[PDB]
Every structure is written in structure tokens, then in C-alpha cells.
């Protein structure tokens, strides 16, 4: 590329020092740039690289209105859930993708980044809700979960729980309990002039 080229900030998203937790998933909007997907291809870091709606071999070839990069930390057994039509704890109550989802999902093992001797308890996942999340909904409420018939207004106790529970990341965790950083690149197809396009020799 020329030096004067305006590339998209995929480096900032994927190489951020600290990710938000899934319950409060972080959204960065990417617009009016040239999307270099060469940074993503052949990476020796990623353990999960899937795309929905588009083939990843034709990413350079496509233009979009906007690209939304969502980022959060999950455990190994729960990487399954960040996909269309998937169900679970983090899929229902934390972060939900549409069934008609057009985008890509990338994840890598961040064992040596997010685990800590003694345990890192800075990543919060929601465990309870009264209702399942809509696609691309974000719940950050601190309302006490009422599981019983009796109200417990603003007080935790029996049949009443704090909705947000802390992930425990130890360096000696099993594969499925080890932390994984996840980036969800969502491509937008709005009826407006496209801004994010691949290399000039492609599109």
C-alpha cells in the first residue's frame, strides 16, 4: 500500500491491551477506510475463525456501509456460543448474534494475558435474566434477579442473586476454562453509499 492510504483500524481492535467483559461488550465502528484483511489471514494466533454470509476468501472483494467490531473475553467451552442460532449462558444473557447474521467471528486463547496466579476476577458474565437478549442487545443493569415469588427490592438473599458473576481465570485452568479474547466483525448492508471497501486491486 502507499503510505498515504487510509487503512481500517483492525490492529487497534485485535491488539487492544485489555478487552471489555462479555456482559458489557465493547463496540467500535469502522467507516470510510480501506479494509486490509491480510493482517487476519494465516494468523498463527487464532483458534477460531468463522464467517457467516460471506466467504473469508472474498473479504478483499466486498464493500460495506459500516463494519462493527465487538470485543470481549469468554472461556474455552463458551466460544461455541458466539454464533447465529446458538444457545447458552453467554449466548442468551450476554451477547446474541442474529440468525440472518452477516459477518465474521474470530477468537484466540489469551491464557497468558487474562489469567493470573491467584485468579483474575475482572471479567464479569451475566448469569441470570428474566428475558433472553435480542440480537445485538447489551444489558449492563445491576438490578437484583428475582427468582422467587417474594419480592426482594434492592436486596440480595434467598432466591435473589446478583446477576453478574465473575469469571475465574487461573494459569493452570483446563482448555475449556482458559480465557479467550473474541472479536466479532459485523458487516452492515444499509441502503446508503458504502464506505469500507477492500484493496483497490480487488474492489
Amino acid at each position, epitope marked *: *500500500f*502507499p*503510505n*498515504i*492510504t*487510509n*487503512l481500517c*483500524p483492525f*490492529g*487497534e481492535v485485535f*491488539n*487492544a*491491551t*485489555r478487552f471489555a467483559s462479555v456482559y458489557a461488550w465493547n463496540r*467500535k465502528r469502522i467507516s470510510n477506510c480501506v479494509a486490509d484483511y491480510s493482517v487476519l489471514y494465516n494468523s498463527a494466533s487464532f483458534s477460531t475463525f468463522k464467517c457467516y454470509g460471506v466467504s473469508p476468501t472474498k473479504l478483499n472483494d466486498l464493500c460495506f456501509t459500516n463494519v462493527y467490531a465487538d470485543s470481549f473475553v469468554i472461556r474455552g467451552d463458551e466460544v461455541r456460543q458466539i454464533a447465529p442460532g446458538q444457545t447458552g449462558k453467554i449466548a442468551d444473557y450476554n451477547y446474541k448474534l442474529p440468525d440472518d447474521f452477516t459477518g465474521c467471528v474470530i477468537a484466540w486463547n489469551s491464557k*497468558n*494475558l487474562d489469567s*493470573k*496466579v491467584g485468579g483474575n476476577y475482572n471479567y464479569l458474565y451475566r448469569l441470570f435474566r428474566k428475558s433472553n437478549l435480542k440480537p445485538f442487545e447489551r444489558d449492563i443493569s445491576t438490578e437484583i434477579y428475582q427468582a422467587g415469588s417474594t419480592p426482594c427490592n434492592g436486596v440480595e438473599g434467598f432466591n435473589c442473586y446478583f446477576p453478574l458473576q465473575s469469571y475465574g481465570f487461573q494459569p493452570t485452568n483446563g482448555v475449556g476454562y482458559q480465557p479467550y479474547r473474541v472479536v466479532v466483525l459485523s458487516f452492515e448492508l444499509l441502503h446508503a453509499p458504502a464506505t469500507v471497501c477492500g484493496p483497490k486491486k480487488s474492489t
Partner: antibody
Framework: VQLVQSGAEVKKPGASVKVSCKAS????????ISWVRQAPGQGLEWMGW????????NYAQKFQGRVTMTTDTSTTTGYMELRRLRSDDTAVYYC????????????????????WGQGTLVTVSS | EIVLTQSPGTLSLSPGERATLSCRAS???????LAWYQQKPGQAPRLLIY???SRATGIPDRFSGSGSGTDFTLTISRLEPEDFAVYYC????????FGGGTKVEIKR
């Protein structure tokens, strides 16, 4: 990838110096630029950080009321102007390619100052 | 404000031996926001280690990044004649600060 700097400049106290840092070999708009000064026979001292994208900047406290940084995308050249110079400002000034803070979102990145300039000696004396 | 303290700041070692440089922070620095730098006399500094462990591109096998919390280390497995230089640690956990440096001297 290479960073090239103005060249040694000598000025009186109270005056202004403006060092230029030309960037080539990489998409200029993607990476940010940061400045570090080194007094003779002393350690490195962080000055500030400039985004080549939006122009947002973060300076240290010691330089907050004096230093001003600018970039030009057309020339791929970043500037560092330090006004109200003092005798203790006599140092070698380095520009470096930044992978500690993102240009677009201004959030911390896993890295450091990867590429460095050659440095410009700036002498301030009566 | 975070302060990185490098001691002893002037280390005397015979060539070909292991060099263990120390960088101690005043406050816990996340491993993902601390770096190491080499500077040979009269030259510009170069990045050795970032993210506490990760080597930069054009860096030999000699250099190993380590440490966690407040006490970080830079390990040189074998001191080659070009290695005897000054070394700085750097954090960007809060703002951005450098360490005082550590000159690795040839022990005669």
C-alpha cells in the same frame, strides 16, 4: 520503514523549536507517532503522543503548557514544536512509531515504540 | 503516576554470561503494557520486548522477556559483544513512563 528527522538545531531561551519527523514504509494514518527526549548522559523522557488519523494528542505534565504536536498526511510528516524553551530542554529529541495507543480510538495497544528516528540535537543556552 | 525503578542501573558482567536486568514498578502494571528497549552508545533506542514477553521482529534468541505485577525482568541468555549497552523498561498501564535505564558493562 524509516523515520527521518530535521537535523541539529540551536536556539536561545524563550524561543521556539520545531522538529520534523518524516515517515515512510507504512500506512501513515494507521500508526500513531510519539516523542521522547534524552538529556545528555541521562535517561529517556516521554513527551507526548499524536494520532495521525484525527489529530488527538496526549502530552506529559512537564510539557503540557508548552509543547504542541502536528501531523500532515499528504507529506507523511509529523512535527513537534516546543515553545518557551529553557536551559534544561537541551536534549536529543526522538520521534518514534507508536504501538502503545491507537490512532482511531485512542486506546492502549499491546506493543511499544517499534521504529525510532535518528534523533535531533536541540541546544538551548544563552 | 507510575515510576519504574531499574536497579542496579549499572551492571558489570563478563561476556558470554547471563544478564538479568530488573525493572520494578511502583504500582501493578498489566503484563500487556510493559516493554523493553536497547540503546547502544550514541545510537537511537530500539524495541527489544513488548507485552512483557513478546519479542520484536529483528531481535535475536538471546533476549527473553519476563516478569509480572510490579517486578519485571529482561533476560540475556548469552552476552554477545554488541549487547553491552543501556536498557530501558517502559510502561503504558497509566499514562506513559520510562525507567532510569541500566548500563550493561564489560567486567574486566
Amino acid at each position: 520503514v524509516q523515520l527521518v528527522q530535521s537535523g541539529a538545531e540551536v536556539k536561545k531561551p524563550g524561543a521556539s523549536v520545531k522538529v520534523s519527523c518524516k515517515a515512510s514504509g507504512y500506512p501513515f494514518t494507521s500508526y500513531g507517532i510519539s516523542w521522547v527526549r534524552q538529556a545528555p548522559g541521562q535517561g529517556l523522557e516521554w513527551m507526548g503522543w499524536i494520532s495521525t488519523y484525527n489529530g488527538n494528542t496526549n502530552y506529559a505534565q512537564k510539557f503540557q503548557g508548552r509543547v504542541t504536536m502536528t501531523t500532515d498526511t499528504s507529506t507523511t510528516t509529523g512535527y513537534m514544536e516546543l515553545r518557551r524553551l529553557r536551559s534544561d530542554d537541551t536534549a536529543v529529541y526522538y520521534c518514534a512509531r507508536d504501538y502503545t495507543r491507537g490512532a482511531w480510538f485512542g486506546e492502549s495497544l499491546i506493543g511499544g515504540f517499534d521504529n525510532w528516528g535518528q534523533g535531533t540535537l536541540v541546544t538551548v543556552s544563552s | 503516576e507510575i515510576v519504574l525503578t531499574q536497579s542496579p542501573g549499572t551492571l558489570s558482567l563478563s561476556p558470554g554470561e547471563r544478564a538479568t536486568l530488573s525493572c520494578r514498578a511502583s504500582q501493578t502494571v498489566s503484563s500487556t503494557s510493559l516493554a523493553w528497549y536497547q540503546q547502544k552508545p550514541g545510537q537511537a533506542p530500539r524495541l527489544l520486548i513488548y507485552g512483557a514477553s513478546s519479542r520484536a521482529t529483528g531481535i535475536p534468541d538471546r533476549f527473553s522477556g519476563s516478569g509480572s505485577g510490579t517486578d519485571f525482568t529482561l533476560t540475556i541468555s548469552r552476552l554477545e559483544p554488541e549487547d553491552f549497552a543501556v536498557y530501558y523498561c517502559q510502561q503504558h498501564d497509566t499514562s506513559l513512563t520510562f525507567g532510569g535505564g541500566t548500563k550493561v558493562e564489560i567486567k574486566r
